[PDB]
């Protein structure tokens, strides 16, 4: 968007075409979010804190987006594991001389 409406190839025409949506820029008339109410807690000066409605949250996700991975594992948990120890026990010497189903 270089003083244009993003359907044109002034500089940075491409990567900003991948914009999520960000409703704020086309909805800055709604205002709204008048939803704090008179909480009567946070706070009192006995008068409650006067509320002024705010604007839209502005999108975010500035940091690099998740690359579809779950993670949440520990190197120590991965390294030893019970699986290797169980496998190197109550198993072995299986050559399939005859055909038989196994777990």
């Amino acid at each position: 968007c270089d003083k244009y409406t993003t359907a044109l190839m002034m500089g940075n025409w491409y990567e900003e075409r991948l914009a999520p949506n960000q409703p704020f820029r086309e909805n800055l008339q709604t205002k709204s979010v008048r939803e704090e109410e008179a909480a009567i807690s946070f706070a009192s000066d006995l008068i409650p804190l006067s509320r002024v409605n705010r604007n839209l949250p502005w999108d975010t996700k500035g940091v690099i987006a998740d690359d579809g991975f779950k993670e949440f594992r520990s190197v120590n948990r991965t390294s030893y594991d019970p699986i290797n120890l169980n496998n190197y026990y109550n198993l072995g010497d299986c050559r399939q001389l005859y055909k038989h189903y196994t777990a």
Partner: peptide
């Protein structure tokens, strides 16, 4: 005003009054 904003913003219900 800043506190008014932070309460009305997202996750504004986490902080104890």
């Amino acid at each position: 005003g800043t506190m008014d904003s932070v309460r009305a913003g997202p996750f504004g219900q986490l902080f104890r009054p």
